[PDB]
């Protein structure tokens, strides 16, 4: 522990919306300090979204205006994508970093496959 709960795959309709769940159980002493969502480009995961103490940032231009990440409750950092494009099909990684009181960081990630259905 902690571990992320993310489904193996999700579907969304072309030009519609989809949610990519990413949830976890908050743990005493584990302060969430970073969230990233990444898209897989071959061997390399590429950040598309970052949340840190400065707020939320979309990191790849093709997702501008189309990406939100849940922030109402601790432990839910699910990603919402809108106006889905066929080229949004990909493996996506949810990645969360926590810091404990001693300054150690703990990182967890988990993958889903998004399939965009015409």
């Amino acid at each position: 522990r902690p571990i992320l709960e993310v489904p193996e795959s999700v579907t969304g309709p072309w030009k519609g919306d989809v949610n990519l769940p990413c949830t976890y159980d908050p743990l005493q002493g584990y302060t969430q300090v970073l969230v990233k969502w990444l898209v897989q480009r071959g061997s390399d995961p590429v950040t598309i979204f970052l949340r840190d103490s400065s707020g939320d940032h979309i990191q790849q231009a093709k997702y501008q205006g189309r990406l939100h990440v849940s922030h109402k409750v601790p432990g839910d950092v699910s990603l919402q994508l809108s106006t889905l494009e066929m080229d949004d099909r990909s493996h996506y990684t949810c990645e969360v970093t926590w810091q404990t009181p001693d300054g150690n960081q703990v990182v967890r990630d988990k993958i889903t496959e998004l399939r965009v259905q015409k």
Epitope: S43, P45, D109
Partner: nanobody, 125 residues
Amino acid sequence: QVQLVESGGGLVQAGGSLRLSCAASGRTFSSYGMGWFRQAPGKEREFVAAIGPFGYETYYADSVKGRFTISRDNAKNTVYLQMNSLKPEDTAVYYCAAGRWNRYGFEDQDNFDYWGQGTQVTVSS
């Protein structure tokens, strides 16, 4: 439906080697990370090695680095552990496991959703 089936354990002399195999069936595991763990009787299970889903990314416990090699053939959904330069303290039950981590958390047993049955490795002088 899903099972991870291990094989290849047995008795070897120190300095010898074994190949463990973990055949995963019931679904495609090409985009899963795979791991090996080991446990001695009455002791805690501990990390041995892992291989990520993407690229060519392998990870090892310090105690086995340079001696053990994890590898996979995705066309057969099988992960291997080549255990070279074996030592008596490598004696344990070895388990494979599969999960959907990418780069992180591969030593956390909670992060693997499917586990093999274990196979016994014994190394004698």
